[PDB]
Every structure is written in structure tokens, then in C-alpha cells.
Amino acid sequence: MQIFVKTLTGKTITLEVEPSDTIENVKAKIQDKEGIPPDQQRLIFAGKQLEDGRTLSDYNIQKESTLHLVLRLRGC
Amino acid sequence: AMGKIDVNDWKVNTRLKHATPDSNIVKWFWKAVEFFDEERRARLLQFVTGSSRVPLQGFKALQGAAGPRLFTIHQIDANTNNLPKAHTCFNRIDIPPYESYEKLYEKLLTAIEETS
């Protein structure tokens, strides 16, 4: 299927995913498109932070849904 | 009070960690700062320190959460896909050994523009 990942500046990223893909798998696709390692990625959908263990199906993410990318670049 | 960040004051009061003034990522960092307009310089200063304003006595008086912390560029042994890391509670930026000025430039711009 197809989902969108919107950055902080409005940049929209189109990913080809599957409801069985895990959040770690989705971040790997974001890196392929944007060069951002998954450890520096935070994904938010419906105001909830997506954990690496679950899948897109666990969060009720369907085709054409929009995820938000937050960069975890500052530790303190 | 001039509205420009004093880059010479910034450079002279910057400590280097696991790098020298001859290190590529240091020379590329300051070249990027030189080509950053004022907005990007302020966005960079706040990215690393938590605010875009310098103390009245300049970068030599820079404070961290727990006391005096000079602005520090730290070259890290990390995978070069990593964007620069910032630790605002002690004003340090961690930079992987990027392969070109172009890569550091884009990574740094992405870090300060896609944060907060």
C-alpha cells in the first residue's frame, strides 16, 4: 500500500508499505528515501509515538494515512 | 547592539573534541556557518545550545545546565548517515566524519531546519 510521512517543514515522503511491516521496517524505508537513520527517527500517528516492536496494523494505519517524522537529534 | 552573531567570537571560543582546526569536519563546519544566512546561524546556535542569544560577554562566557560549558564541536566515531547530534545542556554538537563538505552541509542544514 501507500502511506505518507510528513516532516516538520511540510516535506511529504511517500512510502510503499504493507500492514504487516513493523515500525522498524517503516523507518528503514524512510532512511532509504531521506538518508536519516532509524535511531534518529521518531514516528507519530494520531498523536501517538510508534514503537519499533509493533506493526502498522497494530496502530490502525491504513493506506494514504499520514505519519509525522520527528528527528531525535538532541539528547538534552 | 548589532543583530549579527559574532562568528569570530564564536570560532575563537569553540573547543574541539577529537578534532583539530585542520580536521575536515571543523573546516567544513565553519565554511557552512560562513555561508549560512543569519537565520540559519541562529537556528544552528539554538540547535546546539537551546537559545539563539549569546551572553553579553560573548561565547567565552557560555553556560551549560550545570555551569560553564564552552561551545564544543565533537567529531564522533559514528555512521556517516547520522545527522549531527546536539547536547544543549552542555552546548556540544557531535558530528560524524562526513566524506565531503557537501554531505556535512546538507546533514547540518537538515538537523537545524527539521528540529522544533
Identify all chain B residues contacting A8, using CB atoms and an 8 Å cutoff.
114-116
Count CB neighbours of B98 within 10 A.
Answer: 22
Count CB neighbours of B96 within 10 A.
Answer: 20
Count CB neighbours of B21 within 10 A.
Answer: 10
Shortest CA gap B81–chain A (Å): 6
Shortest CA gap A30–chain B (Å): 12
Domain boundaries, position B65: 1-116
Paired strand residues for A13 = A5
Q: Report which secondary-structure segment, H or E, holds A25.
A: helix A23-34
Domains identified in chain B, total number: 1
The CATH number given to whatever domain includes residue B71 is: 3.30.2410.10
Residues near B48 by beta carbon (within 8 Å), at least 6 away in sequence: B71, B86, B88, B91, B92, B93
Tell me the technique behind this structure.
X-ray
The residue to which cell 554531505 is assigned: B103
Distance set, CA B77 to CA B18, B19, B81, B97 (Å): 9, 11, 12, 7
* Helix, strand, or coil (residue A36): coil
State the Rg of chain B over Cα. Answer: 13
Residue B15 carries which side chain, given as an amino acid letter? R
Give B104: exposed, middle or buried? Use CB within 10 Å, 0-12, 13-18, 19+. Answer: buried
Domain boundaries, position A19: 1-76
Q: Report which secondary-structure segment, H or E, holds A63.
A: none
Is the CB of residue A10 less than 8 Å away from at least one CB of chain B? no
Nearest to A73 among B79, B81, B115 (CB): B115
For residue B111, which of B87, A49, A23 has the smallest C-alpha distance? B87
Which of B45, B47, B80, B81 is the best substitution to test chain A (most A C-beta atoms within 10 A)?
B81
Whole-number Å distance between alpha carbons of A12 and A59: 20
The reported resolution of this PDB entry, expressed in Å, is 2.5
Which residue numbers of B are catalytic?
Answer: 89
For residue A44, which of A67, A26, A24 has the smallest C-alpha distance? A67
Residues near B53 by beta carbon (within 8 Å), at least 6 away in sequence: none
Identify all chain A residues contacting B81, using CB atoms and an 8 Å cutoff.
31, 35-37
DSSP of A38-54, one letter per residue?
Answer: GGGEEEEETTEEPPTTS
